[PDB]
Every structure is written in C-alpha cells, then in structure tokens.
Design a protein around this ligand. Sequence first.
Ligand code: CUZ
Ligand code: CUA
Ligand SMILES: [Ca+2]
Ligand SMILES: [Cl-]
Ligand SMILES: [Cl-]
Ligand SMILES: [Cl-]
Ligand SMILES: [K+]
Ligand code: NA
Ligand code: NA
Ligand SMILES: [Zn+2]
Ligand SMILES: [Zn+2]
Lengths: 581, 571
Amino acid sequence: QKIHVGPGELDDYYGFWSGGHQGEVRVLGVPSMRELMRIPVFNVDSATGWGLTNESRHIMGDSAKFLNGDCHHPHISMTDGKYDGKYLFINDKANSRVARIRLDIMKCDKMITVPNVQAIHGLRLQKVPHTKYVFANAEFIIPHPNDGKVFDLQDENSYTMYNAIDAETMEMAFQVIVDGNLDNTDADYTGRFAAATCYNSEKAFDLGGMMRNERDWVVVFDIHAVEAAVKAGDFITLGDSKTPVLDGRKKDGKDSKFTRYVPVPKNPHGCNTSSDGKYFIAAGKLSPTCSMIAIDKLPDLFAGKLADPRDVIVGEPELGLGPLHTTFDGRGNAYTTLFIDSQVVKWNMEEAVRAYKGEKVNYIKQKLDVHYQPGHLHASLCETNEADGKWLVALSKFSKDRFLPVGPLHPENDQLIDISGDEMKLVHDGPTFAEPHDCIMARRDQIKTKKIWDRNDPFFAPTVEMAKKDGINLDTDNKVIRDGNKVRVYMTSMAPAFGVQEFTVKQGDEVTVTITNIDQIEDVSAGFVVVNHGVSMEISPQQTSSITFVADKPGLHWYYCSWFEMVGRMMVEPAWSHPQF
Amino acid sequence: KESKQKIHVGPGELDDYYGFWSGGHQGEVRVLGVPSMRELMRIPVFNVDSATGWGLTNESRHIMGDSAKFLNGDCHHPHISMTDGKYDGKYLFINDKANSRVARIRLDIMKCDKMITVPNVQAIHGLRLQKVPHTKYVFANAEFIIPHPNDGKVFDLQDENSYTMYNAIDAETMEMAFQVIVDGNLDNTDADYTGRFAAATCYNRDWVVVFDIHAVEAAVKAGDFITLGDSKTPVLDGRKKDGKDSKFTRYVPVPKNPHGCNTSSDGKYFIAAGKLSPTCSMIAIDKLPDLFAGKLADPRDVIVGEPELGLGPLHTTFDGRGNAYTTLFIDSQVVKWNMEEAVRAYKGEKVNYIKQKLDVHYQPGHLHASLCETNEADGKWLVALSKFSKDRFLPVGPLHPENDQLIDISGDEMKLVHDGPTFAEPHDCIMARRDQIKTKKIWDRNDPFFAPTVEMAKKDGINLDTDNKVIRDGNKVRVYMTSMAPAFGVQEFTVKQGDEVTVTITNIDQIEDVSAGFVVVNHGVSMEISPQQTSSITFVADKPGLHWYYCSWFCHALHMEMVGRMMVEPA
Ligand code: CUZ
Ligand code: CUA
Ligand SMILES: [Ca+2]
Ligand SMILES: [Cl-]
Ligand SMILES: [Cl-]
Ligand SMILES: [Cl-]
Ligand SMILES: [K+]
Ligand code: NA
Ligand code: NA
Ligand SMILES: [Zn+2]
Ligand SMILES: [Zn+2]
C-alpha cells in the first residue's frame, strides 16, 4: 500500500481533523497527512475574516462574541449507513455548541448553542435511514433552573441531558434528561437506538466521588419512543427554550420508556458502533476491558424480555491498561487504544464473544506500540458499512522525543498505520497543533467540492437581501450609499482593481464594505484589509462578503487586497469639521 | 556532483532543519521540520489563538498593548537574528502589514515576547535584519505614502508632507531607533555584512535606495533630527531636495518596479529583482563608500551586473557556492545562475551565466535556500513558495492552498522533491540548522513573559509556587491556584454576578510535555499553562448559577475529571 505521495500525485482520502482547543476544522490529504485547508468554526480567522465578517457573525449568532472553541468529534453525514458527503458536524465543549460545515464550499454554514446545558462533548450522527439527527452529549451536570438559587448537584433538578439536533435545519429536535452524565455516543444501523457512555453515575464534583462506583453504564436511547412522546405532546420545556424535553431518568428503580442503563465498568469512555451493526462497544478506561453490547438484544431489553440489563452484554474482552476508543477494519476485527500501555490492540470481535461464553480462544491478534498515550483512533470508513480496512490513525497525546524540540508546548502525534494486512504497520508520525482529539476519513470520490460560488448561495443571501433594500445590483454596482452616520460601500472586484478605489466618510461613521468578486476563474481569490482598523476578509470568485467597522481615525487610510497595485483609499473627514454630538 | 539528499523522515527519526513559516493573512508563525515539511508548532502572534489563549490572556494582551484590540494580522517576512553574519538562535522577527506592527519571537520558548506598532506609518511589509556585527537593528519598510500629519486636513498624496519612511527598530529593546523619510514607495529590504549599509527597492526606471546607517546614527547622536506627532522617534530626511542628495541615502536607478532585494551570502551584492524587467540588477556593496563619498560620477556606476533571466523575476537566494536562484513569476520557474559570470557578462564577455531552469507549480514568489541570509549558506535545501497550486493537491472548495515546493540544491542539478500545501499564503520562510536552535524544556519561574503577573501576585502577598487563594477586592476577584495533573489547586469558588474575575494558574508539574489548560464553559475563556508557567485571564461573571471550568489539555488518564465549579450568586 502506497504511503508516500510525490509531486504531482494526489492523496487517496480526505481527512477531516478536529482542531482541538484551537477551534477550527482541518482538511488533510491521506496518506500524505499534509494539511490542505483550514475551515474556521469557533476560532476567529484573520485570513478569511471568519468571526469578523457580517456573514460569519450572522451564522455564529450571539456566540460571535466568543473568540474560542474546543472541538473533539468531527463526523460526516450518512445515507443508508454510508457517507453522503453533504455535511460535517463538530462539537464545541467550551461554549456548548454544535456547528455544521458544508462540504461543497468547505465552510461552516450553521451553528447552534445548545440550550439549558453546559459542555457539548460527545457527538455522532444517525446512520439509518440517513442523518436526520445529530446526537450530542452535554457532559456536565447543572441546576435547572441555573439561576443561582441552587448549586447542589444532588438536587432533583440538577442533571445533564442528551441532545438531538435536526441535521438539516440545525434547530433542536429534543433533549432527554439522563441520570449521571454523558461522555461519548454512537448510533445503530436502524435509526431506533443510540447509546452513550457515562462516567459520573455518582453525580459528584470531586475526583474520588466520580470514581467510586465499580460500574457506571452506557445509557441506551429508544429514539422511536422519544419521537412518539414528542408527537403525543408528552414533554416539558425548560426556560425560554421550546425544545421538547423528555425524562429518561430512572424513578425509584422503574425505567423510563426512553432509556435503559447497561452497567459497564468503569468510568467508560469510547462508545463505538461496529461497522457490521452488531455492537455498541464501550471502552472500559479504568477497567482493562471493552464491553460489547448486542444491538440485536436491545428490542427484547426494552420489552422486558431480559431479566438483567447486563444480559445485553455478549463480550467483555480483557485488552490492556486504559482502553479509550475502538475502531473497525470491516473484516471482523476491532482496534482499541490503550492509553496507559500506550498501544493499539487488534482483536477479533466474534472470538471475544465466544470467550465470553467460556470458550478458551485468544481473541487478541496484535499489540502495536504507539508514541505516546493514544486517545482516539480511526480506521478509514469505520463509521459506515463500507469500512475498508486500509488506513488507521491513532491520535496520541504526548509526542515527547518523536519530533524536534519546540519549547515547553509539544505537538500531538497522530500516527498513520497500515492495517490492509494481518499485521499493523506504523508508517508515519504526524505532528499536529492543539490536540486534535479525533478525525474522520472519506474516499476522494465521496467529497464533491464547488470551485466557484453560486450567486444565490445561502451563505451570503442575507447580504444580498440587504443590498436589494439599497437598490443595489451586486454583480455590477460600485456605489457608496449614505444613511445618516452609516455608510454602505458596495463594489465589485476583478483582479487587479477594486471597483471603488476611494471613498470619503465622516469621523465616527459606521462603514460597511460589501465586495462581490465578479471574476469567474478558479483559484483567483481576492482579499480586503483596511490598514490599522482590524479589518480583513476573503472574497472568492462569485462570492459576496461584507464587513463593518467604525471609521474612528481622521485622515487617509489605505485598503489593499491581501489574497493575491490593487489598493484603495478611505478618506475620513475629522469630527471637528462636522456637527458635534 | 549529484543532488540525492534523503527526504523521508520516518517514525522515530528527526528532521535536520527548523523551518519558520510566515502565517500569511492568518497572522501566526509556524515551525516546520525540514525536510519532512511537517508543521511542528504554531506560534500565535497577531491572531487570537483559542488553544493557548494568546489574545485572551493578560500576559499576551500586555505584550500586544493597545493593538490587542485587533484580531487580525498579515504576515510576510520572517527572519532570525544574527551575530557576526550567522544565525544566533535568539529571536525571530516578523511584520504585520495589516495593522503596521513588528513582533519579536523568542526562539527558546517559541512565543511572541514583544510587539511594536510602528508610529506615523501605514503597513509594515518588507523586513530584514542587520547582519554584522549583530542584529542591532530590525529594518522595516512602511509601504504606503500618507500625509504628515494625517489629521484629515490634507488628503493629497503629492503634498510636500505626504511620504513614507524606512524604519529601524532596536532589536533588543523593541523600541523605535529611527525613521528615514524616502522618496517613493518601499518594497523589500536587506542589509550588508558590515553594519554600515542597508538597501530597499523603491517604486515612485525606479530605484534601490541605499541607506548609510553610520551617517544616520551620527546625526541621531548629534541631535540633528526632528520628531513627528507624539512619537519621540528620531526622524531623518532621506529625500532628494532640488536634485541634491541627503547624507543618509543614495538612489540607484534600477528597472523596473523592482521587487526583491537580497544580499548575497559572500556579502558582495545587493541583488534587486526586476519584476517588469526580465533581469536582476547587481549592486556592488564595495562601491557604496565611493558612492556616498561623491567619488563616482553616476549612481548607476555601482551596478556591476544586470543578467537577463526570464519573465517576472521576483526574489533571489544563494547556495553559498557562487550561484543565485531567482523566481520567475511569469515563466513559473526557478532559474539558477552564477553571479561572477553575470558580472563578467555585464562587462561584455561572451559567457553563459544561466545554469538551469526548473519548472515550479505555479507562479513562484519568494524562495529561500538554507542559511542563505548568513555567511554559512550551505547550498542544501531550497523552498520556492508558489501562489497558485491549481491541480497539485486534492480540491478543497473555492479557496486553495499555497504550494511550497522543496527542492534539493546540494548538487549540480536542482531536483524538485516535495509539494507542501500551506494555508493563507505564507509568502516567505526561513530555515536554520537543528543545532542553531536551543529550546527550553520547561519554563523558568523568572521568565519576563509572565513577570508582570508575578508582580501582581506580589502585591497580593501571593507565593505563586504554593498558594491556592481567592482575593476579594470590591467587585474584583483574583483567584490564584497551582495546577498538578489531575487536579486544579482551587476546585470551587464563589463570586457575585457582575464581578470581574481574574484566574491565575501556576503549573507546578516538572515533567516535560504535561501541559495544563483552563476553560470556563460558556464564558469565552481558554488558555494554556505549560510546566512551570504562570498564566492569567480576566472575564466578567455575568451569568448567575453554577458554571463549570475544566482542563483542556489531555494530560492524564483522569483528564476528563480535572474540573472545577465557579458559583455566581445573583445580583
Ligand atoms: Cu473529547 S474525548 Cu476520548 Cu473524544 Cu478526545
Ligand atoms: Cu489537566 Cu486535561
Ligand atoms: Ca464513575
Ligand atoms: Cl467514542
Ligand atoms: Cl526580498
Ligand atoms: Cl552547483
Ligand atoms: K499534548
Ligand atoms: Na443558528
Ligand atoms: Na511593545
Ligand atoms: Zn514578500
Ligand atoms: Zn515578493
């Protein structure tokens, strides 16, 4: 299998990397592991203007006031258990958001702050019949209401919730109150069931408290039951949020209709659906095991056909110290990170099931040393029924001596591993910034990108509407609209000239500059920077972009095209020559 | 004779060089390993970095000063300080064209430690360092002509007081040293190997303006200068007046809208790339004393070569073996040529100085050979940074990566060996040998980077190395804590809604690589605390109720559980 991509050759896979606490999404070529693009999401990007432009701030909403995010879990939308290449979704643990990225333009196009929760961590997508819901865990228990009356996590109204977002509308669909908390989550291959690990069944705030119980659990959600209660109006609402809220807590040992709690040791972490749809596999973390939940036994479990929730466990292989996450080659093998032993362990799932029945059989096939302390791992197409068994990325948290020293802060080590054969082969050490936690690969032919914008693209349609109100045809017009102390500049751009090369305003005016790149050649992006005003943005071919700033300094102020004589001048008349307020 | 260096750095092997890439319009500096071309680290400078909290923390905002209000930068030209014409590994400097700044990066901690807004100018673009006897000055071009004063009375760019200026910054103090008014616009700049001369390409035939830095220093020492506005910076007038020269400058006619301005590693030439002219112009540095002394009949007499090379020459670099390498933007090539043969051709000899043209993909701007800015230029690696990558990488939407192409120059024939895609047009880069960079493994508790925070802690009676304390001061709350995986030293505290909370964390772990983080959920608060570092961040607790904070940097098996609670009592 070819590991090295030479000049003129192209990568075989796209890789979509979480940006970690840096807040972006990164597009890599696989197997070269080179970074092809950065997609700003929760970060403010000087280069494109994301977080500065009106289009981007409109998408972020009120959360545009935050300059940070913390992402972990990128996932690609699916149709019938296969990637359809439409959307990528990712979490923000820092400011409790989910974002949607459109894979045709490689931009974030939608963002939501999840109501009545703190810290969106675990995230994964419904697989079947398609990605109708984005499933997202809120990790931290909080009071409801959280108004400063009650701080006690043991209060009956202190809890966290499982969250379902409508993937197409990026509005909330429902939330389910759970016992304990929520770590990671995955969905089955039918649409009925989703599942999440919990590490804080104790509802504690201290370290020893969260570690007390020998078993926490994975909570299983009957999504069909949830939907039926919503359609029946059997729900409540919290605060000013209209989101339907269902109670999936146990009441005095009696289960709700919406959830079952399968005891799993111990502070379990990863929650991974095998690519054949047979299992939710929970990684034991503090227990040296994974627990294999038989999805085929879940209907009987919710129908009371089983005596003990543990009856849905059909395997619990002992694997090594600190199992965190599991992935799949599509050949029947699972691959699990061992954080403490610092390895990836390859094991056969059907043999583990047989060992759980007492059959003496060695289900462990290989242990590969990684460098060092691996967290997530990802095999190519592992989240689909097309899991191809070719590439594996293990994302390790301490790179130590594997790269040149660069000061007290080290890179992460994302190691590419060839799993096409019976023996795992470490082929490449990939240093990355700010701790990507996890990544997702797609075949080259699963992603179809636009090379030039459509003039009706929803990304800037609000700006087109604003322009229409000013009587502006954006494809042609080079005009300065004045409106009190507001100035709206509209111009076309075509290399190497701005359509408006100078304009004059009064000191203190609020200036909006809207630029429509009317070029039609690929790769010829333009930029716009106003010197010493903190203004910067990208305008690609046929895109309209706009940015608003206060002309707070009198005098002449240059603007220039960043993304390459293509310059202009803003002239600001001093306040003392104009009416005084 | 052959170019046959190994390019593969396999698992467990280390790169041979550091590469320092400009972050382009994204505003950071990036550390790469060469020849693997992998990005080892991002150093935030003019960008706001969610990961480390640069732009959010009190330490970073103190370094940025008032310019902390800007969330953008536009970087181009990274350079490493020198002693006796060789890299000394102390500092890296870089420009900000967008908000007119220069930043200094300390190469032992790989952080920006100083930043200056250059007064009375717009857009710092070209930038290079004094070489000899060391980098006493950072030389920086302000690109755009503006009125002086720029107070809104005069907008006329032809006015006698409309001009731009060449800027000298004291590398060690990061304060302005002096500014020189010039005729025309400044493009790129470089310095000689004595400390006496610097040069910059100019567009108003245009010119290369040469600065006699010794003459400038003498005028400053004598008090023969003016100041502009409210800046104390000495300002000298390097313009021609009624055709008569300043003592500070000479204008050497050079075709045509010349762009790159590069000092050859043997110290013989300032080489200006011709752009609109399919040539480079070679200025003999050893004729400059005669030029300034009035012993030459014509400023053109310092030109000793003008080789014809191809369409669109933009920048030049050196292998230390006598060859120059120049980017041809239109022809989309690197052309390797012999400088002494070009000089003889200029005198009329029949000699072909062109050695090879290598196709690059596509439209190269800057290029950089390893150690090319030093008298130790080693002729091993070349990076050409091309603007239009077209079909050289997988498609990724309407925006495309820059193509930074690694070229083996160790032998007679240039060999293209790697295409490296990069984000936001890095534009230019610089390389250093592995052994020229020495980095700290853990922070020093006396480090100036957070010394102002240590001072604040001292005013509160706090021993940062041990204390876990909450200081109440009106509506201000100052939390001080130690951190040691997997526990914050203060795991809960209570404030009043509206309070201004400062959280100062000292990571007292001693193990390399065990960094800690701090994030306050739904408050826009995030920062890094590496081993032995103190970091602080200020935010207002504007929301009543229980608000979680957690460690963002995976540091331990129990990392998910390294958390705390801020309790905010309602108004
Ligand atoms: Cu957020 S956790 Cu194992 Cu996913 Cu990294
Ligand atoms: Cu300390 Cu994560
Ligand atoms: Ca527990
Ligand atoms: Cl998981
Ligand atoms: Cl140059
Ligand atoms: Cl040679
Ligand atoms: K790390
Ligand atoms: Na929204
Ligand atoms: Na400063
Ligand atoms: Zn440049
Ligand atoms: Zn250039």
